[PDB]
Amino acid sequence: AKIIFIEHNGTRHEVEAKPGLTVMEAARDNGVPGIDADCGGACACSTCHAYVDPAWVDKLPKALPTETDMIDFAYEPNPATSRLTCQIKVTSLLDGLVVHLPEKQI
Numbered sequence: 001a002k003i004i005f006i007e008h009n010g011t012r013h014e015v016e017a018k019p020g021l022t023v024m025e026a027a028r029d030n031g032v033p034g035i036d037a038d039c040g041g042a043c044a045c046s047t048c049h050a051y052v053d054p055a056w057v058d059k060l061p062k063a064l065p066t067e068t069d070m071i072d073f074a075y076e077p078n079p080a081t082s083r084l085t086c087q088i089k090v091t092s093l094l095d096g097l098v099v100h101l102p103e104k105q106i
């Protein structure tokens with residue numbers, strides 16, 4: 001499944017992620033800039049924050065309270081598109097998924 005990461009300045013990164021991996025790993029394991037992933041996907045740092053593209057938001061599973069609670073600690077979260085990538089699992093049907101990276105991670 002191809003995952004597309006777009007930095008805030010508009011630089012496009014494309015990665016081929018195997019189903020089962022998380023979006024966070026897809027970016028981390030492939031050297032995509034903008035994702036810190038400090039807690040390693042334990043949904044405790046929120047430094048894997050990103051804005052899912054409006055066109056795909058409805059195709060992802062909805063966020064659980066544990067995740068939503070942690071997004072409020074991310075850098076400039078968006079109630080509509082913000083998500084923690086470590087909480088989104090790649091699946092073949094998400095081939096072509098587009099994610100926009102914030103300017104900073106906290």
Ligand code: FES
Pocket residue numbers: 024036037038039040041042043044045046047048049070084085086087
């Ligand atoms: S990488 Fe720590 S919250 Fe996702």
